[PDB]
């Protein structure tokens, strides 16, 4: 832990805090209600979810190291250049500083020639260049390893599924809103954005051509084909085929939701029955993911709970109240779709679904943030698939 | 070096940087030229000089520790709770954050009931309370030791002059502008500040009653009586009486400058000869301080220079270019009064002297910042007065 690393963590976090405060006041007074900020909020939602994911990943690394979860061995990392929690904090703070600066430029641009729609383009271009620049520049080993995983994950059936690919595909399943916002940005730039004044002022926000449904299922599709690939590599259907069923429930939920969204303008009487199908399949998917979590993912609700009631018999975390709060919050957050459909169906507030998605996306990232702790703890305690050698 | 200490250093410095940037832009556009900002700049000049002194003191501690200057033994400190450079950085960053917040409130106040003239009052009241609050609160040992020294220094003839009192009195001699601004704040509040709207909009800026001359000489008076006290304790006139002469040159310079400032309105023909006396005594004082610095204070220009030309024979700092640049910059900064009188006499710009003092006060703090390095290095190498036991 070099002194300048912690200094950069604190420096970036302090600049981040002051910039978030400045953003809040700028939105309160400086921002004008005439321009619609929904495309802006979606693009910067993708960015902010990435930054929040990096912060929570640093917290996860901190918890794993101070609890005993040997995530270095689980992730198959070299124990020489493994990224510490502080380094993830610098990455998150750096990208958050550029996020805040780009958003502030979108609020007020202190340049007369440079337009506003380039600031997000420049921001995400800097993210991509930071990820893929060939030179041995900032954190070269980390992003090279991440780029290798990003290549292996998106071409899943042709590579043997190790733990790193699984884990990253699950994080992508949590961060599907980032892919959603990337697709929305591309569609908005190519079709709706008038390259004249700004990005303020929609044929890309809905499922008109069904492309967004494909983007929704892309993480689910990768996980599904990884389960099938693991079936081919090891003929054992009990974990893998049921997990693939768990992801195909997501497939069915997404396609029925898209079908209802398309049919709401068609006027077909089958719209109501498609809504029924979407609701029941959302129930099935929510219970399927929740049960899989608490049983096979976290390993809780074991038959050998003992003193640790409603839990397993080895516990590495200090307080069990963490476990019970995690179980509960998992129940609501997996079933948060019930809350969202209730508020979007019992109210007539304009652009309700956009607000609901905007607030519940960080809650989904937080849900996977909590999921990481107990999934990796379960893996550290007893092997689940991707070890095949020892318990550790 | 705890991790959270460096984290607080970085956090405070980052907030400081963003707040200084916000202050710059606020002064560029938000600030209104109708209100005179000179009293504001003087009060916050005292504050900023204190913060800059703390930053440079942290830099000095860093240099002393990584060079070998045993300032812990020289200052007579317990080697258990001695303040590290990082802790001084937290103190400086904390006070700088409150300084920036108070100045920003003076620019725009986000409160309708609270007036503007309390923000500096609240800021310096917080400084005093942080210094003198009896509880074992933030950095209790440090400010207790500092308060003991602040008591011993201001009552000098009745206490035996150790190194700590000398050193702190010299820093007060450098930071005489802080006492100047404190006196100006008290006089402005008591006489000129209308407690109706704000501090914007002078019988306290000049030497009308000669009080400011006393405030100027107060650090010089303390050093003079410390030299006399050291003469009484040790009958040896060679260091102490000549040093007291060095400070009485400051006395003569200050009283002649005040006499000229008073006589400029009298119209007496003796005004010109008083200006001559002030100029020649400023020359004498500048050469007296500069020669004392490079000869007895820093120990340079020794007769045993050897390879280290124009220096001494033991050097602890890596590069000699530091020494030569220090010598030079000492020549200009001690003689910076020549630059200031030249620009204030050959130009007719309004409020020139205020600008000159505002810019050259941090240069005086920087001059003592450089003075600390070589004075403490000379003391570490060979004893100068306040050791009497060993060379170290
Ligand atoms: C509209 C939204 C558009 C969004 C824009 C597109 C997204 C931009 C993508 C760029 C941002 C990502 C910044 C890169 C941070 C990655 C840091 C990282 O991977 O640290 C990890 C830390 O190691 C760990 O496994 C512990 C924590 C788990 C790390 C999980 C990987 C991080 C995933 C975050 C990026 C996901 C991609 C998101 C795309 C939407 C790699 O470690 P290492 O390489 O340094 O050491 C391994 C030893 N070697 C190297 C020798 C093999
Ligand atoms: C208009 C302007 C008005 C200005 C307002 C008035 C000024 C406000 C005054 C409050 C600000 C000062 C904040 C206090 C910081 C002091 C920190 C400090 O003294 O650290 C020092 C660090 O120790 C050292 O000696 C090394 C560096 C030299 C320290 C020099 C003292 C600092 C002087 C700064 C304040 C000067 C006062 C300025 C008044 C104008 C004390 O160490 P310690 O107490 O922690 O350890 C010693 C062991 N014990 C304690 C057991 C004996």
Swiss-Prot record, chains A, B:
Residues at which phosphate binds: 170, 173, 246-247, 334, 367-368
Impact reported for residue 246 to A: Decreases phosphate efflux
Effect of residue 340 to A: Decreases phosphate efflux
Spans within the Extracellular topological domain: 32-36, 110-115, 195-201, 268-270, 350-351
Entry GO MF terms: efflux transmembrane transporter activity; inositol hexakisphosphate binding; phosphate transmembrane transporter activity; virus receptor activity
Catalytic reactions on record: phosphate(in) = phosphate(out)
Effect of residue 368 to A: Decreases phosphate efflux
Consequence of substituting residue 170 to A: Decreases phosphate efflux
Keyword Repressor: no
Marked site: Gating residue for phosphate transport: 337
Segments forming domain EXS: 203-392
Effect of mutating residue 11 to G: Decreases phosphate efflux
GO biological process terms held by the UniProt record: cellular response to phosphate starvation; intracellular phosphate ion homeostasis; phosphate ion transmembrane transport; phosphate ion transport; response to virus
Topology in membrane: Multi-pass membrane protein
Effect seen on changing residue 261 to C: Decreases phosphate efflux. Decreases phosphate efflux
GO cellular component terms, A-Z: plasma membrane
Subcellular location as annotated: Cell membrane
Activity regulation field: Allosterically activated by inositol hexakisphosphate (Ins6P).
Subunit relationships: Homodimer.
Family: Belongs to the SYG1 (TC 2.A.94) family.
Disorder: Basal ganglia calcification, idiopathic, 6: A form of basal ganglia calcification, an autosomal dominant condition characterized by symmetric calcification in the basal ganglia and other brain regions. Affected individuals can either be asymptomatic or show a wide spectrum of neuropsychiatric symptoms, including parkinsonism, dystonia, tremor, ataxia, dementia, psychosis, seizures, and chronic headache. Serum levels of calcium, phosphate, alkaline phosphatase and parathyroid hormone are normal.
The name this protein goes by in its record: Solute carrier family 53 member 1
Name of the coding gene: XPR1
Covered residues, full protein: 229 to 628 of 696
